[PDB]
Amino acid sequence: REVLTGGHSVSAPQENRIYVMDSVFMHLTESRVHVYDYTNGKFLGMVPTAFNGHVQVSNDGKKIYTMTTYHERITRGKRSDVVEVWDADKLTFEKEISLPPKRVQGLNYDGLFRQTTDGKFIVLQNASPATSIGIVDVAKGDYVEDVTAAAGCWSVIPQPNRPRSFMTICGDGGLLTINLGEDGKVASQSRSKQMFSVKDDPIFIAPALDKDKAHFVSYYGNVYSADFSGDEVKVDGPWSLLNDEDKAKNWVPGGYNLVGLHRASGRMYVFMHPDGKEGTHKFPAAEIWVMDTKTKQRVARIPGRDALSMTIDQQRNLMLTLDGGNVNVYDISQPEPKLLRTIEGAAEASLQVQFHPVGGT
């Protein structure tokens, strides 16, 4: 009567999909991506990612990229670090791209595994523990070479106003910009002036990323900016997120992927908690603050639902937040966010959620 079949595509359209990167820290060799429909909370499928997987969706929306580590016998034998290309609609494996055995192993900050604006290169963090940036040529299915200029730096911030350029944060408190050639090798580079004091006002690595600038928040609740509208990056700050009352109750940022920018309005979203002191920079959000980056004033504050990470969709005016296991969906078309729903049990140990891309040319 009935016959069980495979070969099926994900049941909901791409524009409904989100990706919850479950580290499964208790069993970190069985990390996976959980695919959910944000419109109704339905579980749609998953992609296995072995030991401490990282994930992104191709800018064109067609493929899912994962990065992971295998060994021949898991806890012994030869190491293979790889990028894998998966079909986004069938959730099937297509291609493995070999990496040098030094891809970053760590929690899922966005900037560890990114791509150029044009989608042509995957750009990833290496640590041996010496740091460099790895470049993967998507068309060729090849590793290009290490960006050794990025030694002593950390994380990848693509420049959305150029096809194959990105920046990284360096130990001198400035930014290194890398411009790739068509072959994925470094064509040119430049280093900014000092943006922030590493000792006195360290910044969180997560950018609030606009098309031609990026903002960063600090451990003490200051904001720094990098303008890359020109070939040379211009840096500024600090300004404070905090008014007098805020300072009196020691409000400071905290989380992992803890900020976001709504590009059309210039609204910046930040997880914040009171009673800040040394050691609280990864505390869950007591609140989300919504800052106008032009006026440099807060325009809203709402309950944080113990969130640690977020992401913003520019095309549908949404923000997702994530507390490690549950995902909250917000409408951010107005200054005050509105909670639409919560997806309970989306992961066991996730610090990263991402939308399936829509548009974005």
Binding site: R1, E2, V3, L4, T5, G6, H8, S9, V10, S11, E30, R32, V35, F43, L44, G45, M46, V47, P48, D89, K90, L91, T92, F93
Partner: protein, 119 residues
Amino acid sequence: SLNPDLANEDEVNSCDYWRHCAVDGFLCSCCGGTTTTCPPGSTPSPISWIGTCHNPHDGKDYLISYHDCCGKTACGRCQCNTQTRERPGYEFFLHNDVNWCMANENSTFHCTTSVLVGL
């Protein structure tokens, strides 16, 4: 009662649904598939354990085939462990404490289901 796709999703996703009477694993219908389709990127087992379940809606008894979907790691959702007429491994194809993905190209168990064979 014979067509889960027409039924209430919450009804078919329950361990108490009549046709799930010897399921040991995660229901595929909670894992991005349906009662009769593997979630994307998982492969049906060509072999299965079997048995009959009573349909209380129409009062008849049906042959059920409990195929797994394979080649992805554990779904983790809607775990069931029902044992009506289940027997040990000396009645092998009535037995549900083994991985019915055991002969697939990749034996990793993702989810299970209950395929209606006939009366």
